Design an enzyme around this catalytic site. Structure first.
Site, PDB file in Angstrom:
ATOM      1  N   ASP A 189      40.127  37.374  36.126  1.00 32.90           N
ATOM      2  CA  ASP A 189      40.586  37.288  34.692  1.00 32.90           C
ATOM      3  C   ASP A 189      41.626  38.392  34.516  1.00 32.90           C
ATOM      4  OD1 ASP A 189      40.928  37.074  32.025  1.00 32.90           O
ATOM      5  OD2 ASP A 189      38.964  37.973  31.562  1.00 32.90           O
ATOM      6  N   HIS A 345      41.180  47.708  35.901  1.00 28.67           N
ATOM      7  CA  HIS A 345      42.143  46.866  36.631  1.00 28.67           C
ATOM      8  C   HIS A 345      43.377  47.716  36.861  1.00 28.67           C
ATOM      9  CE1 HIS A 345      41.186  42.735  37.066  1.00 28.67           C
ATOM     10  NE2 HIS A 345      40.479  42.804  35.878  1.00 28.67           N
ATOM     11  N   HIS A 379      38.883  43.598  40.313  1.00 26.23           N
ATOM     12  CA  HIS A 379      37.815  43.044  41.185  1.00 26.23           C
ATOM     13  C   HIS A 379      38.462  42.910  42.616  1.00 26.23           C
ATOM     14  CE1 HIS A 379      35.290  42.285  37.674  1.00 26.23           C
ATOM     15  NE2 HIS A 379      36.297  41.575  37.120  1.00 26.23           N
ATOM     16  N   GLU A 404      37.009  36.293  44.120  1.00 21.67           N
ATOM     17  CA  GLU A 404      36.536  35.791  42.825  1.00 21.67           C
ATOM     18  C   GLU A 404      36.887  34.289  42.778  1.00 21.67           C
ATOM     19  OE1 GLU A 404      36.857  37.789  39.016  1.00 21.67           O
ATOM     20  OE2 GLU A 404      36.419  35.761  38.094  1.00 21.67           O
ATOM     21  N   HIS A 406      35.667  32.161  40.167  1.00 21.86           N
ATOM     22  CA  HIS A 406      35.019  31.839  38.887  1.00 21.86           C
ATOM     23  C   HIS A 406      35.258  30.397  38.424  1.00 21.86           C
ATOM     24  CE1 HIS A 406      34.184  33.993  34.802  1.00 21.86           C
ATOM     25  NE2 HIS A 406      33.442  32.836  34.959  1.00 21.86           N
ATOM     26  N   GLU A 449      31.993  37.132  40.240  1.00 22.76           N
ATOM     27  CA  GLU A 449      31.965  35.792  39.679  1.00 22.76           C
ATOM     28  C   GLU A 449      32.380  34.715  40.671  1.00 22.76           C
ATOM     29  OE1 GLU A 449      34.382  36.833  36.121  1.00 22.76           O
ATOM     30  OE2 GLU A 449      32.493  36.582  35.001  1.00 22.76           O
ATOM     31  N   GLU A 525      29.133  45.409  34.279  1.00 20.76           N
ATOM     32  CA  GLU A 525      30.006  45.327  33.102  1.00 20.76           C
ATOM     33  C   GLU A 525      29.129  45.321  31.856  1.00 20.76           C
ATOM     34  OE1 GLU A 525      32.859  42.189  35.609  1.00 20.76           O
ATOM     35  OE2 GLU A 525      32.767  41.923  33.408  1.00 20.76           O
ATOM     36  N   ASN A 585      46.500  28.940  28.611  1.00 22.91           N
ATOM     37  CA  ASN A 585      46.338  30.404  28.667  1.00 22.91           C
ATOM     38  C   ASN A 585      45.113  30.820  27.877  1.00 22.91           C
ATOM     39  OD1 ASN A 585      46.981  31.513  25.747  1.00 22.91           O
ATOM     40  ND2 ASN A 585      48.618  29.985  26.259  1.00 22.91           N
ATOM     41  N   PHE A 589      42.356  37.330  25.314  1.00 22.11           N
ATOM     42  CA  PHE A 589      41.232  37.716  26.197  1.00 22.11           C
ATOM     43  C   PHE A 589      41.619  38.716  27.310  1.00 22.11           C
ATOM     44  CE2 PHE A 589      37.109  36.702  24.919  1.00 22.11           C
ATOM     45  CZ  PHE A 589      37.297  35.737  23.923  1.00 22.11           C
ATOM     46  N   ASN A 592      41.015  44.020  26.655  1.00 19.76           N
ATOM     47  CA  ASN A 592      39.575  44.380  26.465  1.00 19.76           C
ATOM     48  C   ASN A 592      39.340  45.843  26.670  1.00 19.76           C
ATOM     49  OD1 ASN A 592      38.971  41.684  28.871  1.00 19.76           O
ATOM     50  ND2 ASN A 592      39.270  41.285  26.636  1.00 19.76           N
TER      51      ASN A 592
HETATM   52  O1  LIG Z   1      37.057  39.525  29.364  1.00 20.06           O
HETATM   53  C1  LIG Z   1      35.988  38.740  30.058  1.00 20.06           C
HETATM   54  C2  LIG Z   1      35.318  39.514  31.266  1.00 20.06           C
HETATM   55  O2  LIG Z   1      34.253  38.629  31.717  1.00 20.06           O
HETATM   56  C3  LIG Z   1      33.444  39.012  32.789  1.00 20.06           C
HETATM   57  O3  LIG Z   1      32.468  37.930  32.865  1.00 20.06           O
HETATM   58  C4  LIG Z   1      34.335  39.201  34.037  1.00 20.06           C
HETATM   59  O4  LIG Z   1      33.672  39.645  35.316  1.00 20.06           O
HETATM   60  C5  LIG Z   1      35.542  40.105  33.706  1.00 20.06           C
HETATM   61  O5  LIG Z   1      36.474  40.071  34.820  1.00 20.06           O
HETATM   62  C6  LIG Z   1      36.287  39.618  32.428  1.00 20.06           C
HETATM   63  O6  LIG Z   1      36.782  38.289  32.622  1.00 20.06           O
HETATM   64 MG   LIG Z   2      44.057  28.284  25.622  1.00 17.15          MG
HETATM   65 MG   LIG Z   3      36.165  35.879  35.974  1.00 17.07          MG
HETATM   66 NA    NA Z   4      39.361  39.580  29.816  1.00 19.36          NA
END
Ligand SMILES: OC[C@H]1O[C@@H](O)[C@H](O)[C@@H](O)[C@H]1O
Ligand SMILES: [Mg+2]
Ligand SMILES: [Mg+2]
Ligand code: NA
Ligand SMILES: OC[C@H]1O[C@@H](O)[C@H](O)[C@@H](O)[C@H]1O
Ligand SMILES: [Mg+2]
Ligand SMILES: [Mg+2]
Ligand SMILES: [Mg+2]
Ligand code: NA
Ligand code: NA
Ligand code: NA
Ligand code: NA
Lengths: 1011, 204
Positions: A189, A345, A379, A404, A406, A449, A525, A585, A589, A592
Site C-alpha cells: 500500500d 516507508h 514492507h 506482499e 495482498h 499481507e 501495526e 486509486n 489512504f 497515514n
Molecule cells: O493504510 C492501510 C494499512 O493497512 C495495513 O493492513 C497494511 O499492512 C499497511 O501497509 C497499510 O496498507
Molecule cells: Mg477508488
Molecule cells: Mg497491503
Molecule cells: Na495506507
C-alpha cells in the site's frame, strides 16, 4: 525470452548476496570507515528515454545514445520527472491479476551512462557493478554486450563486469521494466513507481577475496563476558599461506584480535569448508548495545598472507547484544523490551522513493525526540544507510522481506504455491545475507499481507537455521501462525475482540491467554494515524505497561505519502491518490503519518511522545515518585523541572536533579508550596529536561512531562451589584436588548441570537445556532465512497439519519425582564422526515454588567446515531491575530486524544488554531477550556472549541487543503460535548463507547462577555 | 450550608426563585449548589440544580436533595429501574418499567443498617399526592440517613414521623470486590467536578 513474465527466472548472471563491502586495501581506512578508492559511486547524470513497452526500444540504443534521450539525475523514480504517472492503489493490484503475466503496455525506462574506468582496475582483480534498487526488473548491457538481469526491487543486484570493460570510456545500457512477475510480490500500500531509485556503484575486489562474513556475539549469564565469533568465507586462489585476522576495536583501542589459516572444522564425511575460517575472540565486560545506549565496536576483517601482505580488508560496526524470547518474553540483553515503534516507508514528497541521508537523519532525530525506540521496515528491505544510522543512533529494527501479495484472492494464493517458493526464497535469503551483521536488526519479518502459505513455513525455518540470533515474525494468516515467534497482529484493539472468521483480531489482552498460547505479543501495526487520529492511543500504553507479555507495537505509520504537484501559478500543493490521473486509486489512504511529507508534525505526534515517555510519575502529598522505564541506563542526562501555577498564573517552580537507576525509583519531596487563598485550581506540572545535547537532541530537550491538580479553591465571592439594567424592546420579529454601549438582537422567527453590537459595531456574520455535526474525519468516513457507500461508517449513519440536513423548528421563544436582567427562553426541535432527532432548550440571561449567560439543555433521540458534537456555532465579524485560552493545549486535542495536553494559559496566532490536514476535516479542537479570548470577546464555561477562517461546511466540501479559502470573519465552534475521533483503524468504526455521545440528555453553560 | 444568594423574580406566567449555597469545612469550600425553582400556572415546580465539588475533596457519596415529607402513604409507584433495590454498579438485573410496591418494600432490612433501597434510572416517582419527574435515583423510607448511620442493628430502628425522601441526581457505586479496602471502580465515583440535574415536583 520474456524473463519478466516468469517467476522461475528472478535473475541471470547475478552475483551472490553478502554484507556491505568496500574492499579497502588499507586496514586503518577500514577501521575508521573512511571512503574506499575501490568503491566508486556512479550516481549523477545519466541519459534516459521512456518507451511504452520493451518491444519499442530500438536496437541501436545498445550501442549508441539516443538523440532524443534526456539527461536526468540517478537515482530517481521516473514518475518524479513526469515521464508517466505514479499510481496510488492500496490492495487491488495496479495491473490485471493474471500471474505471471503483466500488461503488454509496460512502461520501459532506458537508462544509460558513459563512464570512466581506470586501467588499474582492469590490470588485476574483479570489477563489479552494484544496483542497490531497480524497480521492478531489468536487463543490463555493458559496451553493447548483454550482462544479465535482476528482480526484487528492494535489494542490491550485482554483476561482474570484468570481462566487459575497457580502459577509459565505457557505456552502460539498463532496460528497466515497470511491471514484471516480481510485481505480484510487491503489492504494498504505497505509490506504485519505477526506475533506478537507489545508488549505483562500482566495486573492485581482488581475485582472492572475502566473499562473505558473519559476526555473532554470545554471552555468559550476566553478560559480563562475551565471545565474538566471525565466520569468514573466501573466493579465489586458496593456498596455505592465506590467513584471516579479525580485530575488534573500541575507538582507537584494539580490544581483541585473532588470526587463523583457512579451513573450518570437519562437518561431514566429506570433510569441512577449506574456503572458510571461524575466528573466536574473547571479550571481557563488553559495552552492550541497545537503543538506549548504542555502544558499538569496529570489527576489521583482514584477508592476508601469513608473512604480512594485506590482500584486502572488509569491516563492520558490531553491537554486543543478545535477542532471545524466553518464558514468553522478548528480551534484549536479558531484560524485557517495551517497543515504542513506528512503521516507516521510504518516502520523499519531491523525490518519491529515493532516500537521502539528510532525510533519513531528519527522520531518526524526530523519532528519538518523540520517544520512539524502534522502527519496522514496512514492507521491504531499506536503503543500506538506514541500518548504519539505526546502529549508530540506536533504534531496534524489524527488517522485512519485500513480499506482499495482498491483492490475491485468497491472500495466500501465491504463498501457498510451491511454484512461487523460489521467487519468495530469494527475497528472504538475500535480505538475511545482506543485513545479518547489523546490531540494529533485532527481528526478521517474512513480508506483509500475503496470507499464510507453506512457503512461509519453509522460509521461517530457513532463517531459524541460518540465524539463530533473532526471532522471526510474520503477521499473515491471523498473526499467531506457525510461521511467527511473536504474536504480531495489526490493529487488534486493546479490549475489544473482532472475531472475523479464520483470522479473528482478538483483544490483545485476551489473545495472550488463549488456551495453549505463550508467545509475546507486539503489534506489527496499530493506531492508524490517518488524518485527525490517534484517538485511544493511551489505552494501548496503559495495557502495554500493565501486562508483561504485551511488549508494545509499531504505529502505522511515520510519514504521509503525499507528493508535491504545482498549480497554474506554480505553487506547490500536497497530492494524494488519483491526483495524477491514476485510476483506480485509493485517494487519501496513502496519508497515514504522524508527520506530514515535509516532516512537519501532525498533532498526534505529541500524544505518541507523551504516552511513550520513559519516566512514570506518581504524586503523594507533595512527594513525587519518578520510576524509570529504561532497562540499561541511569538517568545521567536529566533533571526534573517543576512548576506550580494557579490557573495559569505561575506561583513557584524549581529544578531537582534526577538520579534513577534503570527500572528504579526516586522520591522527590517538593518544597512547602504555594498556598493561595484566592479562587482557582492549583496545578503541578513536571518536566524531564536533558541538560546536555546528545547525538539526537539539543540541550534543554524535554523528554517527558506530567500534570496534576493540587488544591482547588472554589469561588464563593459575589460579583458586585451592577449600577444598571438592560432594557428590552419588542417587535413581532425581534427581541432587542440594550445595555449601555451594548446591544443583542434575537430573531423571533428563527429563535436565535441574530446580531450583537459593541460600540456600534456588528459582531456576527451568521447567527448563533446549535450544531450537532462535524466535517467528517478520515475515521468517520472509513472506506465509504459515493459509488460504494459503507453504511456502517459514522459519516454514513449520520447522513442517513439526516443529521446534516435537519432543520431547526422553533417551539418557543419568549422574553422576560427580571429585576436586573432580561431573560430570553427558547426551545427548538431538529427533525428529519418525521423524526425529531434533537431538542435544544436554552435560556439567555443578560444582566446589568453586560454579561450574557447561556444555558443549553439538549435531548438526543436514543435511536438516532450518536452525534458528532453538541454545541453552538457562529461566524464572528472580527478577524484577530491571536487566540488566548485557559484550557488544554497548546496543540489540537480531542477527548480520546488529549493526554499530552496540559491545562494552562495559552496564546497562539490564529493560524495555529487550524491543523492543515491534507484531506480537510474537523480540526483544531482544544478541550477542557474554561475561558476563551478572541478580539473583544471572552467566553467562559467548561467546553471544547475550535476557531478558524473555515466553516465546517467548507471543510466537508473541500477535498484538499490547498483549495480551502479563508471566509469573511472567523468561524467559532464551541461545544459542550464532542465525540472521540477514534483511529484503532480507519476502515471500521473505532470510537470507543465511552467517547460516544450516548447520554440522551446533555447540559452545558457559557457566559459571553466583553472587554 | 452557608447562603450566597436567594432572589425572587416574577416572569410572565411563573415565579422564579434563584439560590446559591456553599458547604464549607474548616475554611474550605467543599460543594457549591446553584438552583432555580420555577413555579408555573400549572402548579408544577421545576427545580434545576448545578453543583460544584472541589477537586481535592474525596468524591462524595451522592449529589441530591432530601426532605422529610409529612405524610405517610401505603404505596410507592415509579417509572424506572426495578422492582428491587439497585445501585449504579449493581443495576443490571433491574428492568425499566412501571413498578408499584408497598412502602416497606422500598426499605432493605440489612442487619447492619446503612443507605439502602435506592432505585436508579427513574423518570417519574409517585407517593401520596406528590409526583417528581426527572432522571434520578431515589430512596424513600421511614428512616433518616442520620438514624441509619447511628444505628448498629436493624431491630433498633424506629419509624420516624412522615417519610424521608432522598432524590439523587447522582449516586456513588457501592463496590464489593472486597469489603476491607476501597472497591468502587473509578467509573462509578462522582469525580466530574460539575454536576447538573433537574426535577419537577408537582401534584397528582
Ligand atoms: O493504510 C492501510 C494499512 O493497512 C495495513 O493492513 C497494511 O499492512 C499497511 O501497509 C497499510 O496498507
Ligand atoms: Mg477508488
Ligand atoms: Mg497491503
Ligand atoms: Na495506507
Ligand atoms: O480552574 C480550572 C480547573 O477547574 C477544576 O475544577 C478542573 O478540575 C480543572 O480540570 C480545571 O478546569
Ligand atoms: Mg521473472
Ligand atoms: Mg595488523
Ligand atoms: Mg600491475
Ligand atoms: Na508489557
Ligand atoms: Na540526572
Ligand atoms: Na473534506
Ligand atoms: Na448503621
Amino acid at each position: 525470452r520474456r524473463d519478466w513474465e516468469n517467476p522461475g527466472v528472478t535473475q541471470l548472471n547475478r552475483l551472490a548476496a553478502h554484507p556491505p563491502f568496500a574492499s579497502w586495501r588499507n586496514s586503518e581506512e577500514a577501521r575508521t570507515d573512511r571512503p574506499s578508492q575501490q568503491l566508486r559511486s556512479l550516481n549523477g547524470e545519466w541519459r534516459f528515454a521512456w518507451f511504452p513497452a520493451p518491444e519499442a526500444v530500438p536496437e541501436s540504443w545498445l550501442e549508441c545514445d539516443l538523440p532524443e534521450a534526456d539527461t536526468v539525475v540517478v537515482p530517481s523514480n521516473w514518475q518524479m520527472h513526469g515521464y508517466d504517472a505514479p499510481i496510488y492503489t492500496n490492495v487491488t493490484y495496479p495491473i490485471t491479476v493474471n500471474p505471471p503475466f503483466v500488461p503488454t503496455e509496460n512502461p520501459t525506462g532506458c537508462y544509460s551512462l558513459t563512464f570512466n574506468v581506470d586501467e588499474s582496475w582492469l590490470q588485476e582483480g574483479q570489477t563489479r557493478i552494484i544496483f542497490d534498487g531497480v524497480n521492478s526488473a531489468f536487463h543490463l548491457w555493458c559496451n553493447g554486450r548483454w550482462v544479465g538481469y535482476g528482480q526484487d526491487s528492494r535489494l542490491p543486484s550485482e554483476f561482474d563486469l570484468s570481462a566487459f570493460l575497457r580502459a577509459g570510456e565505457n557505456r552502460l545500457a539498463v532496460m528497466v521494466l515497470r511491471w514484471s512477475d516480481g510485481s505480484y510480490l510487491e503489492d504494498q500500500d504505497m505509490w506504485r513507481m519505477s526506475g533506478i531509485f537507489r545508488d549505483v556503484s562500482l566495486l573492485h575486489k581482488p581475485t582472492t577475496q572475502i566473499s562473505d562474513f558473519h559476526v555473532a556475539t554470545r554471552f555468559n549469564d550476566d553478560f559480563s563476558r562475551a565471545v565474538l565469533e566471525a565466520e569468514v568465507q573466501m573466493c579465489g586462489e586458496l593456498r596455505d599461506y592465506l590467513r584471516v585476522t579479525v580485530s575488534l576495536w573500541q575507538g582507537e583501542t584494539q580490544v581483541a584480535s585473532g588470526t587463523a589459516p583457512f579451513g573450518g572444522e570437519i562437518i561431514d564425511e566429506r570433510g569441512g569448508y577449506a574456503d572458510r575460517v571461524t575466528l573466536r575472540l574473547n571479550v571481557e565486560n563488553p559495552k552492550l548495545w541497545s537503543a538506549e545506549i548504542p555502544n558499538l565496536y569496529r570489527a576489521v576483517v583482514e584477508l592476508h598472507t601469513a608473512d604480512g601482505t594485506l590482500i584486502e580488508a572488509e569491516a563492520c560496526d558490531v553491537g554486543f547484544r543478545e535477542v532471545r524470547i524466553e518464558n514468553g518474553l522478548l528480551l534484549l540483553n536479558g531484560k524485557p523490551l517495551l517497543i515504542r515503534g513506528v512503521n516507516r516507508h521510504e518516502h520523499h514528497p519531491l523525490h518519491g522513493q529515493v532516500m537521502d541521508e539528510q532525510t533519513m537523519v531528519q527522520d531518526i532525530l524526530l523519532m528519538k525526540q518523540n520517544n520512539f525506540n524502534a522502527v519496522r521496515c514496512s514492507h521491504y528491505p531499506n536503503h543500506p544507510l538506514w541500518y548504519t544510522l539505526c546502529d549508530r543512533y540506536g533504534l531496534y529494527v524489524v527488517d522485512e522481506a519485500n513480499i506482499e501479495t495482498h491483492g490475491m484472492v485468497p491472500m495466500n494464493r501465491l504463498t501457498d504455491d510451491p511454484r512461487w517458493l523460489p521467487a519468495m526464497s530469494e527475497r528472504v535469503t538475500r535480505m538475511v545475507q545482506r543485513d545479518r551483521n547489523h546490531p540494529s536488526v533485532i527481528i526478521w519479518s517474512l513480508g506483509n499481507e500475503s496470507g499464510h502459505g507453506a512457503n512461509h513455513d519453509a522460509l521461517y525455518r530457513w532463517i531459524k537455521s541460518v540465524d539463530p540470533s533473532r526471532p522471526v515474525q510474520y503477521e499473515g494468516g491471523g498473526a499467531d501462525t506457525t510461521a511467527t515467534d511473536i504474536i504480531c497482529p495489526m490493529y487488534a484493539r486493546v479490549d475489544e475482540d473482532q472475531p472475523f472468521p479464520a483470522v479473528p483480531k482478538w483483544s490483545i489482552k485476551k489473545w495472550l491467554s488463549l488456551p495453549g498460547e505463550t508467545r509475546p505479543l507486539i503489534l506489527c501495526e496499530y493506531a492508524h494515524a490517518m488524518g485527525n487520529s490517534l484517538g485511544g492511543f493511551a489505552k494501548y500504553w496503559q495495557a502495554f505497561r500493565q501486562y508483561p507479555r504485551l511488549q508494545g507495537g509499531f504505529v502505522w505509520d511515520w510519514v504521509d505519502q503525499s507528493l508535491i504537484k504545482y498549480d497554474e501559478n506554480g505553487n506547490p500543493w500536497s497530492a494524494y491518490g488519483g491526483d495524477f490521473g491514476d485510476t483506480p486509486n485509493d485517494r487519501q489512504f496513502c496519508m497515514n503519518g504522524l508527520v506530514f511529507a515535509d516532516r512537519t508534525p501532525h498533532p498526534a505526534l505529541t500524544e505518541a511522545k507523551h504516552q511513550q515517555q520513559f519516566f512514570q510519575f506518581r504524586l503523594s502529598g507533595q512527594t513525587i515518585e519518578v520510576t524509570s522505564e529504561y532497562l540499561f541506563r541511569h538517568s545521567d542526562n536529566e533533571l526534573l523541572h517543576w512548576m506550580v501555577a494557579l490557573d495559569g498564573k505561575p506561583l513557584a517552580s524549581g529544578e531537582v536533579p534526577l538520579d534513577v537507576a534503570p527500572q528504579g525509583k526516586q522520591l522527590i519531596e517538593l518544597p512547602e508550596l504555594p498556598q493561595p487563598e484566592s479562587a482557582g485550581q492549583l496545578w503541578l506540572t513536571v518536566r524531564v529536561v536533558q541538560p546536555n545535547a546528545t547525538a539526537w537532541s539539543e540541550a534543554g530537550h524535554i523528554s517527558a512531562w506530567q500534570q496534576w491538580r493540587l488544591a482547588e479553591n472554589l469561588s464563593v465571592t459575589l460579583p458586585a451589584a451592577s449600577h444598571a439594567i438592560p432594557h428590552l424592546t419588542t417587535s413581532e420579529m425581534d427581541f432587542c436588548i440594550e445595555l449601555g454601549n451594548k446591544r443583542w438582537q434575537f430573531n423571533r422567527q428563527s429563535g436565535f441570537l441574530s446580531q450583537m453590537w459593541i460600540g456600534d459595531k456588528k459582531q456576527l456574520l451568521t447567527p448563533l445556532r446549535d450544531q450537532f455535526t462535524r466535517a467528517p474525519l478520515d475515521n468517520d468516513i472509513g472506506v465509504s465512497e459515493a459509488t460504494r457507500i459503507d453504511p456502517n461508517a459514522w459519516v454514513e449513519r449520520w447522513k442517513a439519519a439526516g443529521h446534516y440536513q435537519a432543520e431547526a423548528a422553533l417551539l418557543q421563544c419568549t422574553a422576560d425582564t427580571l429585576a436586573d436582567a432580561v431573560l430570553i427562553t427558547t426551545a427548538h426541535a431538529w427533525q428529519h422526515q418525521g423524526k425529531t432527532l434533537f431538542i435544544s432548550r436554552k435560556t439567555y440571561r443578560i444582566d446589568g454588567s453586560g454579561q450574557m449567560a447561556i444555558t443549553v439543555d439538549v435531548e438526543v433521540a436514543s435511536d438516532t446515531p450518536h452525534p458528532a458534537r453538541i454545541g453552538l456555532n457562529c461566524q464572528l465579524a472580527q478577524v484577530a491575530e491571536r487566540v488566548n485560552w485557559l484550557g488544554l493545549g497548546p496543540q489540537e486535542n480531542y477527548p480520546d486524544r488529549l493526554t499530552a495536553a496540559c491545562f494552562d494559559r495559552w496564546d497562539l496566532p490564529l493560524s495555529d488554531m487550524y491543523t492543515p490536514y491534507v484531506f480537510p476535516s474537523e480540526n483544531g479542537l482544544r478541550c477542557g477550556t474554561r475561558e476563551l479570548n478572541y478580539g473583544p470577546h471572552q467566553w467562559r464555561g467548561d467546553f471544547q472549541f475550535n476557531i478558524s477562517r473555515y466553516s465546517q461546511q467548507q471543510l466537508m466540501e473541500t477535498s484538499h487543503r490547498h483549495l480551502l479559502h479563508a471566509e469573511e470573519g472567523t468561524w467559532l465552534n464551541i461545544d459542550g460535548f464532542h465525540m472521540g475521533i477514534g483511529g484503532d483503524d480507519s476502515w471500521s468504526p473505532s470510537v470507543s463507547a465511552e467517547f460516544q455521545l450516548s447520554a440522551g440528555r446533555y447540559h452545558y453553560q457559557l457566559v459571553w462577555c466583553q472587554k
